[PDB]
Write a protein that binds this ligand. Structure first.
Ligand SMILES: Nc1nc2c(ncn2[C@@H]2O[C@H](COP(=O)(O)OP(=O)(O)O)[C@@H](O)[C@H]2O)c(=O)[nH]1
Length: 139
């Protein structure tokens, strides 16, 4: 179950930090892990890049947010669908240096028909929520 939770974003947004937090539960390749989400026991196979896509930007990195659009166009163009499980993640919410406003990310996730989750991989704030939210978009 559950290919491939491909985690994709601009360098240094926190794709590695988020994933290892999920798998290895510590703040610092592919991973497979049996999880329970809303009662179901399923397998996450997670591709941390260097079926479902976790699209990550950093809330202090404006370029990494504007890159979101290219990732989306490349996803619609490869799955031939405007409904492929995908979640927009605003990482690094623990920082005060926010150049990307919550509303912007949300208005973008809106026009895509996809959820938006603000996260911190440093604190584990909202990490399960982001991945588990990606799985719920399959259902
Ligand atoms: N303050 C803060 N720093 C972070 C967060 N996520 C990642 N980092 C830092 O950003 C650096 C690079 O992030 P990384 O996990 O390598 O993202 P990746 O290169 O896209 O895989 C790491 O040294 C982390 O310590 C976060 O949520 N908050």
């Amino acid at each position: 179950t559950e290919y491939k939770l491909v985690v994709v974003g601009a360098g240094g947004v926190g794709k590695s930090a988020l994933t290892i937090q999920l798998i290895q539960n510590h703040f610092v390749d592919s991973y497979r892990k049996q999880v329970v989400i809303d009662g179901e026991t399923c397998l996450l196979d997670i591709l941390d890049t260097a079926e479902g896509f976790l699209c990550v930007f950093a809330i202090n990195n404006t370029k990494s947010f504007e890159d979101i659009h290219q990732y989306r166009e490349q996803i619609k163009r490869v799955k031939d669908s405007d409904d492929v499980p995908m979640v927009l993640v605003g990482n690094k919410c623990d920082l005060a240096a926010r150049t990307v406003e919550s509303r912007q990310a949300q208005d973008l996730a809106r026009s895509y028909g996809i959820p938006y989750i603000e996260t911190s991989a440093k604190t584990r704030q909202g990490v399960e929520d982001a991945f588990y939210t990606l799985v719920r978009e399959f259902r």
